[PDB]
Amino acid sequence: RYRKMKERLGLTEIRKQANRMSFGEIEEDAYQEDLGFSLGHLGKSGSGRVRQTQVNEATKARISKTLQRTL
Amino acid sequence: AVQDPTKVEAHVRAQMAKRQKAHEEANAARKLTAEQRKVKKIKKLKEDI
Amino acid sequence: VEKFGDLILKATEPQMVLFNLYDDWLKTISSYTAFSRLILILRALHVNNDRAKVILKPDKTTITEPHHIWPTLTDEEWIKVEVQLKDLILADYGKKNNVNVASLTQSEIRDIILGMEISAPSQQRQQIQLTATQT
RNA sequence: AGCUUUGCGCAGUGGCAGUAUCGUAGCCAAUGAGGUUUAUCCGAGGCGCGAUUAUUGCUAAUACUUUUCCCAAUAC
């Protein structure tokens, strides 16, 4: 249980990479509706890795037990 | 397991075999003998007289 | 391992080849017990490659058939040879680093077997009885 | 004489989820709980309160100095 709950709340590589931000490399302001929203090294061609990051399956949104039984 | 892998695996399988042996002897200490099963069936099928 | 050397050193026309380092181990031991045994053996061969060669043959028969690479040995003797191999690795580490093998902790031995350990130069400073002085 | 069904215990091997698990000398309930759909029809728990890492226990990680021996004539 502790391992599963730590993996769910753990800082995934894609979420780790959005935390960062390049120094002096100014990003274009995507997402009009809220400026300041910026992905980190996700696609900014900064200092990340060559391949695209993959979504962690443990972060996939799921529904409750009572909600499922009502469904 | 890094230090002595085979010894550790042998210990783990010893624990597994101990659990299985305990389960099997618990099943055996209750298992009804053939004479007991026969007398049980006969007594169940007899008493409607 | 002299089989790999005898193959590669006298080979031409580069070609792919497949091996199996879990010769017959998987019939009796698990996968990551076989991997740990392989790691111990490979660390030993990295350490000496000749003392471990003698250790890999506890007898003079030691039937290492050409069908596979490692000697056909039993698990009970595998425990003993692993103990000797671990002792060899620790003894070499102590000889090279002037440390005491009995003084090594458990995680110290794990780090010795797996990878390597970090040193500490004099430039690394921990700047992070009383004598009164009149000034 | 095997085969097999149901319910209940003791186990063993797994898988799944920690927004849920348990308690109820509190109340109500097949003399009917709850009913959004299928209502001259369905058919059981519900409410309030309480404990909690949203069940509860362990195991482990977070260190060295007590002692106890000593100098001297082949001489007025």
Side-chain angles (χ1 to χ4, degrees):
Chain A
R1 174 183 190 181
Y2 178 80
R3 283 191 297 278
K4 285 190 273 182
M5 292 325 287
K6 179 215 175 94
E7 144 185 54
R8 292 192 89 54
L9 286 169
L11 181 94
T12 359
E13 208 73 46
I14 169 151
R15 210 172 81 214
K16 189 180 300 184
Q17 192 165 358
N19 187 27
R20 308 187 171 114
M21 167 191 347
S22 288
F23 186 90
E25 171 206 300
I26 293 95
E27 184 184 358
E28 274 130 11
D29 264 308
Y31 195 85
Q32 283 175 352
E33 318 279 323
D34 186 11
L35 300 203
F37 167 86
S38 74
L39 315 172
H41 285 134
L42 278 180
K44 277 177 62 174
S45 70
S47 187
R49 303 192 291 294
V50 200
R51 303 176 307 163
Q52 203 44 270
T53 63
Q54 299 306 109
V55 186
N56 195 0
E57 98 198 294
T59 71
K60 191 211 50 163
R62 60 210 41 183
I63 43 181
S64 297
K65 187 186 291 182
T66 53
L67 192 272
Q68 175 61 239
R69 84 161 301 270
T70 64
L71 260 289
Chain B
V2 170
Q3 301 183 2
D4 39 356
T6 307
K7 183 172 186 176
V8 161
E9 196 199 12
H11 175 76
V12 169
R13 284 180 175 175
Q15 190 195 10
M16 296 208 265
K18 149 82 193 160
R19 283 180 281 157
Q20 272 303 341
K21 192 172 184 178
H23 166 73
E24 290 313 22
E25 52 76 22
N27 291 332
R30 291 177 301 184
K31 193 167 184 180
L32 211 67
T33 60
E35 163 276 325
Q36 215 163 341
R37 294 179 186 177
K38 280 190 174 184
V39 67
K40 178 177 177 180
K41 187 178 179 182
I42 295 165
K43 196 173 184 182
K44 177 263 290 194
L45 210 60
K46 261 188 171 176
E47 295 174 352
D48 39 357
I49 312 168
Chain C
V1 176
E2 277 75 2
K3 294 187 176 66
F4 289 115
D6 193 84
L7 197 154
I8 295 175
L9 292 171
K10 300 295 288 294
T12 179
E13 51 109 25
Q15 43 96 28
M16 182 86 208
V17 52
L18 188 49
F19 289 82
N20 182 1
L21 305 194
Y22 305 160
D23 290 334
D24 298 322
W25 298 346
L26 294 179
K27 302 294 290 293
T28 178
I29 67 171
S30 73
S31 211
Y32 31 77
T33 305
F35 183 67
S36 307
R37 175 185 295 169
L38 179 63
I39 286 298
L40 258 185
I41 292 173
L42 275 173
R43 175 65 52 189
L45 299 183
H46 179 79
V47 156
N48 284 147
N49 94 349
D50 53 359
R51 292 260 301 102
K53 252 304 197 198
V54 187
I55 306 167
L56 280 181
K57 38 176 65 64
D59 202 4
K60 294 291 107 178
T61 61
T62 61
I63 39 163
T64 314
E65 72 207 35
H67 163 48
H68 54 71
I69 177 175
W70 301 116
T72 279
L73 321 183
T74 181
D75 294 332
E76 175 58 41
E77 170 277 339
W78 266 117
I79 296 171
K80 298 282 104 185
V81 64
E82 284 170 3
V83 152
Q84 315 159 8
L85 217 52
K86 182 193 162 353
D87 290 332
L88 170 136
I89 293 160
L90 293 188
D92 185 300
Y93 174 110
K95 191 266 293 288
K96 292 298 186 190
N97 310 323
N98 206 342
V99 316
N100 200 0
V101 294
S103 300
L104 300 167
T105 79
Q106 283 294 50
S107 71
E108 281 287 353
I109 303 151
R110 187 200 68 229
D111 293 334
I112 289 161
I113 290 175
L114 298 191
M116 51 88 89
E117 192 182 359
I118 314 299
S119 65
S122 183
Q123 165 75 1
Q124 260 278 358
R125 307 294 182 95
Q126 199 270 129
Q127 52 162 271
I128 316 184
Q129 293 182 353
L130 295 170
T131 72
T133 298
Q134 284 69 268
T135 48

